[PDB]
């Protein structure tokens, strides 16, 4: 028993991490097979980041000016491209570490661990969502540019964020790694809206579920509600409205605990109307919204 | 900016997982060179659990009864032996994958990432403290047996501790790499008191600092208060009484804000004593204190 804020183990994904320097920049990089992967505006200077020309600024480049250093081995570099927001580095040597790997693209809502490096060494991994807006609250500092988020599925790495930003609100913007950014974010030093965040509804339940598994069961009432009612609910409070999709995915909790999900609808509808009066779900005392029902199967049945 | 609960990358430590069998129990084992250590739980059965004999049941073992296995490959075991709590099992083959390491025994109120591992492969990596009472407040299930806690200095793990149960009461013990139990718990399946936990004052102080770097200023008040003021509230809340190590160790985090130790604990006193209003600090709406002042200049400075 016990719930926690659980990260997929970084190991195959710390063997993947270099550095990568082009000019007086240097950031991270993803180096899969024989190519590196990273934040375009490792090609840009403190001038160019309030709107870079980055077809201008990458012309002036040669595959010479890309230094890449895993540990303390160099790579070389024999070819670039950029394929939206990312660099990609041709180099001459398949990385003997890589794992097997997808890129995907997440929806908002789902979860990934992130891996924060600097100067291509790993310093830290936690576990976050991709918010219904498209930002990440993560933490990162100068030099995290190119640490990546990623699901394990036991032997499988996909790879599914590339960190590139801060906005000035201190929330967290980046890409795929086909370098598509999640969200309306451009990699320009500007005033940028990440618009209305919502709470992840179906997360806030499956939490609810992890709880009734792990003990945690005061907040379980004598009551029920319907989708419409809930969802009236859902939009006074800011949380994105529950589907029928959502009810679906909640199923193997819901028969796990045999709590009806419209029961825990019920629940989750009286705490958002009356608070928490003080006490704790999970040793937290607002609603956690950053674990999906997928998660809390996984930790509550002990998948590797 | 940002602030997670960032665990360690825990690389160095999968590449340490092994499966110990013996009998019909599995559990989890460390290798690091040619010793594997595991719970010596790992040889008793369900009538023995009660009451176990170790000593006894050990006797009855051979070489040949421990099953080691490291991902697909069979370890040979040419020695047995149990030290405290732990058995070590001498191999006849070094781990290769051996990181720089130490055994060393936590304090209460420090933190460390924990691998969960089943059946000797990694599920999740995520960051605790061990509680002023010695137990960790995990996540653990069925198998997680002999998963570590570890701290991690540049190329360097150290190893504090190695999971042995779970209380009836849901929270979690163990003992440090010779075996020996923190707290006061044996390894039998008997009730045990874990006593009365504590806050951890120094960390929710450094926490507020954490807050205070990352823009979340709400807090902060007017008022000062004394070493002895401000224990005699922490007496009240079940907070451990801060003391002049305490506000030394706090000195860097004080230097980098410019709050004075005191003034700090004035704020964290008013929010003892009126708590959170329903406002959030660091996205949490409870003060948190799994976080020392090294792991908060740690993440706000970017080590790795
Ligand atoms: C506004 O900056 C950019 C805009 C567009 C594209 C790139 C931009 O940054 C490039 C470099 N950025 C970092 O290294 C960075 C990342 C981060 O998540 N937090 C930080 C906190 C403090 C100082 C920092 F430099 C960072
Ligand atoms: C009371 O059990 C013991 C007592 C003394 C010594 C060893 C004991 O357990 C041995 C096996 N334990 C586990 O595999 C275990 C560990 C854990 O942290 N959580 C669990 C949750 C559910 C079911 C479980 F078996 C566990």
Request: hydrophobic fraction near 35%; glycine fraction near 8%.
């Amino acid at each position: 028993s016990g719930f926690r804020k659980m990260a997929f183990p970084s190991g195959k994904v710390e063997g993947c991490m270099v550095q990568v320097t082009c000019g007086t920049t240097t950031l991270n990089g993803l180096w899969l097979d024989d190519v590196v992967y990273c934040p375009r505006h490792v090609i840009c200077t403190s001038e160019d980041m309030l709107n870079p020309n980055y077809e201008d600024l990458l012309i002036r480049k040669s595959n010479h000016n890309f230094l890449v250093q895993a540990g303390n081995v160099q790579l070389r570099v024999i070819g670039h491209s950029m394929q939206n927001c990312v660099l990609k580095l041709k180099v001459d040597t398949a990385n003997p570490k890589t794992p097997k790997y997808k890129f995907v693209r997440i929806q908002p809502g789902q979860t990934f661990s992130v891996l924060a490096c600097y100067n291509g060494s790993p310093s830290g991994v936690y576990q976050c969502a991709m918010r219904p807006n498209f930002t990440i609250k993560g933490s990162f500092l100068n030099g995290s540019c190119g640490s990546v988020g990623f699901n394990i599925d036991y032997d499988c790495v996909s790879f599914c964020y590339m960190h590139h930003m801060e906005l000035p609100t201190g929330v967290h913007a980046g890409t795929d790694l086909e370098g598509n950014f999640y969200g309306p974010f451009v990699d320009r030093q500007t005033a940028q809206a990440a618009g209305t965040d919502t709470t992840i509804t179906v997360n806030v339940l499956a939490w609810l579920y992890a709880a009734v598994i792990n003990g945690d069961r005061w907040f379980l009432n004598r009551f029920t509600t319907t989708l419409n009612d809930f969802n009236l609910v859902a939009m006074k409070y800011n949380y994105e409205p529950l589907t029928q999709d959502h009810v679906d995915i909640l199923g193997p909790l819901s028969a796990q605990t045999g709590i009806a999900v419209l029961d825990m609808c019920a629940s989750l509808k009286e705490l958002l109307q009356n608070g928490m009066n003080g006490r704790t779900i999970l040793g937290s005392a607002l609603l956690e919204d950053e674990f999906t029902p997928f998660d809390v199967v996984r930790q509550c049945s002990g998948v590797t």
